[PDB]
Design a protein around this ligand. Structure first.
Ligand SMILES: Cc1nc2c3cc(-c4ccncc4C)c(Cl)cc3[nH]c(=O)n2n1
Ligand SMILES: [Ca+2]
Length: 109
């Protein structure tokens, strides 16, 4: 088939996303959203970070990894079938036409 991430209703879903900062504590803002990265900025936004901290989140969506070291992987808690679909993790590297865009397909059953 093709790369996908899987969960059963009631479980947590785990969607990977990583970048390497230039030096520790020098973070890059990240945009997580539902929908593919060609849509707006990172789809329908569910979570954002900036250079210093998490600045936006939606209930059930988490960065539980070490995001100050570039692990910006997403946890979606207590998934339902409506959570299936493509998600966008966008690494907003400073500068123009240089973002890293990751599209992650989540399948719930
Ligand atoms: C009461 C509550 N708080 C959060 C929350 C907090 C954070 C967060 C903020 C700053 N530093 C580390 C973290 C993990 C994130 Cl990323 C996601 C979150 N999502 C969520 O459903 N809730 N709910
Ligand atoms: Ca950029």
């Amino acid at each position: 088939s093709e790369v996908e991430y899987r969960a059963e209703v009631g479980q947590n879903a785990y969607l990977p996303c990583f970048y390497t900062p230039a030096a520790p504590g020098n973070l890059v803002p990240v945009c997580w959203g539902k929908g593919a990265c060609p849509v707006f900025e990172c789809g329908n936004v569910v979570l954002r970070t900036d250079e210093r901290d998490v600045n936006y989140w939606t209930s059930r969506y988490w960065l539980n990894g070490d995001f100050r070291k570039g692990d910006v992987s997403l946890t979606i808690e207590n998934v339902t079938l409506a959570d299936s679909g493509i998600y966008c993790c966008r690494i907003q590297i400073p500068g123009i036409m240089n973002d890293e865009k990751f599209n992650l397909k989540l399948v719930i059953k």
